[PDB]
Amino acid sequence: IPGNEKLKEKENNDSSDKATVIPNFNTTMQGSLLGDDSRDYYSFEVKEEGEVNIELDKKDEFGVTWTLHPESITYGQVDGNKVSNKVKLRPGKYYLLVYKYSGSGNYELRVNK
Amino acid sequence: KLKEKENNDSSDKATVIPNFNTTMQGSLLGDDSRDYYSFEVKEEGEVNIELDKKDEFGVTWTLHPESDRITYGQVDGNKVSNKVKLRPGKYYLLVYKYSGSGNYELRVNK
Ligand SMILES: [Ca+2]
Ligand SMILES: [Ca+2]
Ligand SMILES: [Ca+2]
Ligand SMILES: [Ca+2]
Ligand SMILES: [Cl-]
């Protein structure tokens, strides 16, 4: 995708206060949940109301999903190596928690309009 | 008056819920953000998982079998609930927070 930037997560990001910012809607966040690292929190700012697509792509076979809520609840839908949803979001800050329920592995996270 | 047993942050360390219709007390304070539990169904039926928040914070749960079947708690104010038909087997129930800190009670009703 033209201009898509790959950006690494920034640990410690295990709570909402410590969330890694997704600075725009054309970034691919790269993260890992190995061993005792079982939660990676992200945030993003919606500036224009509209449908946002959230897609987590597993790079390894493990049990991982996500939960979104506004600062002011949407769950990832697990389908094999993709965990996705589409949701109409109003302007404001959102908190996107990627967390595992089994195993260990790496993932990429794409939040798009 | 049964209580969770830390550390229970992963499924291999899950706190056993010994019986249905039995209240478990837990907390997710500060950097304790995950409490894993397990339970065993012996007869197929509808199970009603109910988490009661004792403080206002963002907490929910995720159920999966020991064997992509996954079920999420539905947040409604201070209750996080669902009803799911389960076949005999072992299940893992992850109670986790997404904001704040607080105490809760958990039941697997049947
Ligand atoms: Ca990580
Ligand atoms: Ca992390
Ligand atoms: Ca606990
Ligand atoms: Ca715990
Ligand atoms: Cl039973």
Side-chain angles (χ1 to χ4, degrees), chain B residues 4-10 27-28 31-36 95 104:
Chain B
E4 62 168 324
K5 296 186 191 305
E6 293 289 348
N7 187 300
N8 60 9
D9 293 1
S10 56
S27 72
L28 291 169
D31 69 14
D32 181 39
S33 60
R34 297 162 57 97
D35 291 341
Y36 243 123
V95 176
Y104 65 88

Side-chain angles (χ1 to χ4, degrees), chain A residues 81-93:
Chain A
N81 81 150
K82 308 292 186 68
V83 186
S84 309
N85 213 334
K86 311 86 221 150
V87 57
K88 185 168 192 186
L89 302 184
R90 69 197 73 175
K93 185 179 192 187

Side-chain angles (χ1 to χ4, degrees), chain A residues 13-43:
Chain A
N13 56 17
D14 299 353
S15 61
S16 70
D17 292 346
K18 302 174 187 177
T20 303
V21 175
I22 304 177
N24 57 55
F25 289 97
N26 194 19
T27 294
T28 298
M29 302 305 294
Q30 297 175 313
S32 71
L33 291 166
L34 307 180
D36 293 335
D37 183 39
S38 65
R39 303 157 54 93
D40 291 343
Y41 231 129
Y42 297 90
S43 64

Side-chain angles (χ1 to χ4, degrees), chain A residues 29-97:
Chain A
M29 302 305 294
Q30 297 175 313
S32 71
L33 291 166
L34 307 180
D36 293 335
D37 183 39
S38 65
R39 303 157 54 93
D40 291 343
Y41 231 129
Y42 297 90
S43 64
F44 60 91
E45 187 77 23
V46 170
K47 292 170 186 176
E48 185 183 65
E49 186 169 341
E51 187 186 343
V52 172
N53 195 76
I54 297 168
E55 181 182 316
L56 179 146
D57 298 316
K58 302 183 193 176
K59 300 305 190 178
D60 312 275
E61 278 185 4
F62 73 122
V64 60
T65 187
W66 56 260
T67 297
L68 175 78
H69 80 286
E71 186 182 41
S72 67
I73 301 303
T74 302
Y75 299 130
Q77 304 299 304
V78 175
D79 193 354
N81 81 150
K82 308 292 186 68
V83 186
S84 309
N85 213 334
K86 311 86 221 150
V87 57
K88 185 168 192 186
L89 302 184
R90 69 197 73 175
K93 185 179 192 187
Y94 287 83
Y95 286 103
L96 179 51
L97 172 62

